[model samples]
Target: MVRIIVKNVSKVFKKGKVVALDNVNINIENGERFGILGPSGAGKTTFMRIIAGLDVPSTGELYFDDRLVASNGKLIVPPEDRKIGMVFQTWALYPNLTAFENIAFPLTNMKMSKEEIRKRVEEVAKILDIHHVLNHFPRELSGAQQQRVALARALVKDPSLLLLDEPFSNLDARMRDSARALVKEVQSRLGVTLLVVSHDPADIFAIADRVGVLVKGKLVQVGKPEDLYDNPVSIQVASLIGEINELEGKVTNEGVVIGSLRFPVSVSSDRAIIGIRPEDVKLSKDVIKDDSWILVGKGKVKVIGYQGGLFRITITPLDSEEEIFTYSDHPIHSGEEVLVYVRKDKIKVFEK
Candidate 1:
């Protein structure tokens, strides 16, 4: 197994007019499941391309197991020599080729013995649970089946690293979840270093041992999925990753003031952004008498939406008029007045 180190990497296009990557630095550990997360145009794909050796960085270096793959001052290694398997969003399988041939393609390039290649292909096909479909052409397979073949093709070579570029995006929602789980299982079984780029939080939570967020061509934050969810570095990241209530306030000795609603908070910054997840906000038919830092207020449920398993209630604060959404155990009728209490410990204050 080989770890990947990307040091001060940058990529530019059009005679250095367009900057695709800007001084990006990443260190992916061997046998680790890591993710690069960002929205479209965040340069995530560009960075992945550079690491995959599909594109050369205009400046900086990429080291594969201490072997310089890309560097301004030295020679660069080619993609084939990097020994990395890549699975893309599109099932990039050959239309006319069977699943077995698709997986055997990499071994064929190495001029392996016919029997050896057949054995290797069969092993990968069985590992991916696609042995039954080994003779099926691309057009004959479903989306998930085709993805299994793609994954099989990538893994059959037994590469040092696996790169998945939004591998589940093409599948429908249900298939996406199942395919994501299957990929994680395969990665675990193969014990290969896996680096994935995805926008879905569920995907990161499901598989990433460590998740890195790429923004504006730079990696802003990297941590375990739970850590990122609990302590987001910025309000933008918190909002992007999950549902959060943004309460603008200025801290005072008595309490933080947001309009006429003054809630006692242990905030360290003079100007801060207070965040509370929807699940953290509690609703009660009657106010629970407690001495804790639970702020008591009443809000009218303005709108409601069913989120498959939970009820999403949008409430208009009677005093602040701030509209905030909270999930409820059961559906709350619209226009119903309910008492809202937010646990201060669950709330977080960040410097604005």
Candidate 2:
């Protein structure tokens, strides 16, 4: 395992016209499972490529365990020499090579003896539980199986750092779950420092201990999964993580005033925006007479969507244009008058 340090890293393309990354700095501890979360065109892949030595930053420095590998657009250590293993979004498996042969490809380049290569390949295959499909080619294996083979090839090299770019994007829903678990298991067993970049929150939550949210070529926030979900710093950050009900309001001595409803909150700002997650909004037929709640109002259900196990109820307040979304396991019908309750602690207030 190796500790990676990126300092003031910036990457520019087309003669400073496009900025892929901007003054990014992060420290990944040894043996830590770190995740970079971002949507497409967010420079996540550019960041990963820089870490892997596949690309160098236009300005800034990269260090692996105190040894400088990249500085000022120059790569000190080439990708092949850096003890890093990378799995691209596309598995990139050889079409004609069997699983065993593909896993042994990296070892072959290192001039290892044939017997040693075979032994190493079998060991990794068994570890990944792909030994059953060792003789099968990529075309013959399932999506999950092929992913394992790709992982096996990377692990077979015995690299200290493993970089995965959207590793679970190719699998179906069920397979994605299983593959995520399998990758986490393998990563823990091998004790390699894992870094994965993905847009899916499920993938990051499943495997990463700490996550960084990247937006517009800049890292917005880095924290534990729960912290980022429950207490997001900004509206953009909150919206990216989950569904939220946003309301325009103004802070007052009593609290925040939204239409005819007043939510009691302690804030110095006069103008504020209240954010409430769908899961935090409580809905009931009877008025919830709780003084602890910040906002208690009556609304009629505008729409109800049954999402397999939970019902998504959209409610519009009597005098407000804003709609509140609440999720419930119980059935809620549209056009029914429902009392909406939002707790003070559950509400995230941002000053405008």
lDDT of each prediction vs. the true structure? 0.80, 0.85
Give a tens-digit lDDT track for model 2, residues 166-271.
Answer: 8878788878988888888878887889999987888888989999888888889999888888889887778766678888787888787776556666466778
lDDT of 1 by residue, 88-153 (tens): 775488888898889898887787899999999998888778899899998999988888889888
- What is candidate 1's TM-score against the reference? 0.91
In candidate 1 the C-alpha lDDT for residue 238 amounts to 80
Clashing pairs in 1: none
TM-scores of all predicted structures: 0.91, 0.93
Clashes of each: 0, 0
Candidate 2 shows a clash count of 0
Cα misplacement distance, residue 138 of candidate 2 (Å): 1.3
